[PDB]
Design a protein around this ligand. Structure first.
Ligand SMILES: CCOP(=O)(OCC)Oc1ccc(OC)cc1
Ligand SMILES: CCOP(=O)(OCC)Oc1ccc(OC)cc1
Ligand SMILES: [Co+2]
Ligand SMILES: [Co+2]
Ligand SMILES: [Co+2]
Ligand SMILES: [Co+2]
Lengths: 329, 329
């Protein structure tokens, strides 16, 4: 009680976030795209309706909060987030930061300028909406580019100023997480403010326990991205692993069994629209995972419980760890 | 009389466009950027005020219309254009198309999808504003990338469907214009619908008369980008030629003297905000060319007249050629 987090509908008590998915998207797009070309998604109205149905399904399954880690260059539309949050009765935390598609107007900026932009979105609000980011999303693509280093440093600085956590995208080992950690630490950022994302891309337990031992949160955040019979489909095969989802889920158990239950965040990296990839990709995705963002609560959590993970431990992972991560600290 | 063109304030008679600058920008930015970070420009209000002063200066000098060739990925903000057009009493023609900073949501699209997007902006309107593009801006960067080829073909197709002209960015010979022409012609686009831009980057008269002889408009569109004493300033030196502006202006005369007065468009490629380059670049630019978009009428046109170009010929270049180009055909 007492701690607050910013959502797209305003401030909420941390203790009300409940079962929280820490890496999700309503729509993965590009800056300006939803506004310039809503018909790409059928219509803005069809996108809202699909997202609200999806989030109502997740809510029925026990999900109370999602963290939408869509940055400016993922075409985050905070008005869309607010509308869907209100219609679905699911809290949504919005993000600042930058992903791997920054336009020239971002790429030309200094660390100090990027810091000011992240702080504006956290402290003032996004665009002219007054809605404030509750997380900072950064991405490196293999070995950090020089601009990516600036982004990571600007993220660390904005976090230090605000207590808001940082969450990352990594390529599949690299293993890019270690370089990100090195940059964050050089800026004096506490690892407990940081989630190293897409850490389920590989079953490298030494990499993962290495990060966890240092205080980092490990984002096991692509839980439903497993499929069979996609070889005649190059673009779909790129997204979906041959590893069963059971294998991804066993990584959560592996980390719990090694003493790191407090260092784990679980999510889907799901979405209801996707213009930054091939056309009609959603048809493929929705056929594979019709449960959408209810996949974790419906499938992953019962599987772990059935494998002997205690309910208190599962509660800790899905409720306590997100609460501690999101609480400005 | 009778022909109409779309402007950001609605339809106007072609014959009212008058003295027209065919390649200009209010603000060179990135999709979404003005909305997410207006303080970059001081404020949106400061940007409007700077642009209105600039355009009032151009208007006092005789300029009646500008064509703002800012595409989606130049962060074109048609509401900004409408506000500045109204306050300055200068017509502004808006653009569709894509420049060299498309986000992933554009880069993943097919020629057919890009065609639909260009047509939406021409026939339906931009975003939700109802303001329709009156020109299609494309860019190649040296040798056309595969995606750039799609853009050029989608531009040709949208032009054929609507009669709206196409205008291009080229690197400084390449000479990229010839490849652009080859693609346009393969799509059956008439050269008289096409302006090959930044053609004043080089004094290659054979290249230029070659295009002009085939019916293309040649865009001599960086008239004020000449300066001295910039060597201690790498970023400024990149924009500004050591060639005096007199030398750029002599290229207009060279083309007129060779019989191609009807194939020439003259402009500045000026702007009042510039976030897609280094910070404070505007301070440099405004010190070099304080006349802004009045530079052509105040300096270039009198210089040509003083060199013996007949007034009727100068009228033809600045008024008739833009009218013929912009008239949907
Ligand atoms: C599975 C969704 O993850 P993604 O990194 O997008 C952010 C949600 O998907 C991609 C989008 C564009 C890409 O460029 C080629 C690659 C992956
Ligand atoms: C002089 C203004 O021309 P520019 O091509 O911008 C469109 C108006 O300027 C540039 C902007 C970004 C660049 O990327 C490195 C290069 C030129
Ligand atoms: Co990611
Ligand atoms: Co993601
Ligand atoms: Co250009
Ligand atoms: Co330009």
């Amino acid at each position: 009680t007492g701690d607050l987090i910013n959502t797209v509908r305003g401030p909420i008590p941390v203790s009300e976030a409940g079962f929280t998915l820490t890496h999700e998207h309503i729509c993965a797009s590009s800056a300006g795209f939803l506004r310039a070309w809503p018909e790409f998604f059928g219509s803005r109205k069809a996108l809202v309706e699909k997202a609200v149905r999806g989030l109502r399904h997740a809510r029925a399954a026990g999900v109370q909060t999602i963290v939408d880690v869509s940055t400016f260059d993922i075409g985050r539309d905070v008005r869309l987030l607010a509308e869907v949050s209100q219609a679905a009765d699911v809290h949504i935390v919005a993000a600042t930061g930058l992903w791997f598609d920054p336009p020239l107007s971002m790429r030309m900026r200094s660390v100090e300028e990027l810091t000011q932009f992240f702080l504006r979105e956290i402290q003032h609000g996004i665009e002219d909406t007054g809605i404030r980011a509750g997380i900072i999303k950064v991405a490196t693509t293999g070995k950090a580019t020089p601009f990516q280093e600036l982004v990571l440093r600007a993220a660390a600085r904005a976090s230090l100023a605000t207590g808001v956590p940082v969450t990352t995208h990594t390529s599949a080992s690299p293993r890019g997480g270690e370089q990100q950690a090195a940059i964050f630490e050089s800026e004096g950022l506490s690892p407990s403010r940081v989630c190293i994302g897409h850490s389920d891309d590989t079953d490298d337990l030494s990499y993962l326990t290495g990060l966890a031992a240092r205080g980092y949160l490990v984002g096991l955040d692509r839980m439903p991205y497993s499929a069979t019979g996609l070889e005649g489909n190059a673009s779909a095969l790129a997204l979906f692993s041959t590893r069963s989802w059971q294998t991804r889920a066993l990584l959560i158990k592996a980390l719990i069994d090694r003493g790191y239950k407090d260092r784990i965040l679980v999510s889907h990296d799901w979405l209801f629209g996707f213009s930054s990839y091939v056309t009609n990709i959603m048809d493929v995705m929705d056929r594979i995972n019709p449960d959408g963002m209810a996949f974790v609560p419906l499938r992953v959590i019962p599987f772990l419980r059935e494998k002997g993970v205690p309910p208190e431990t599962l509660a800790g992972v899905t409720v306590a760890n997100p609460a501690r991560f999101l609480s400005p600290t």
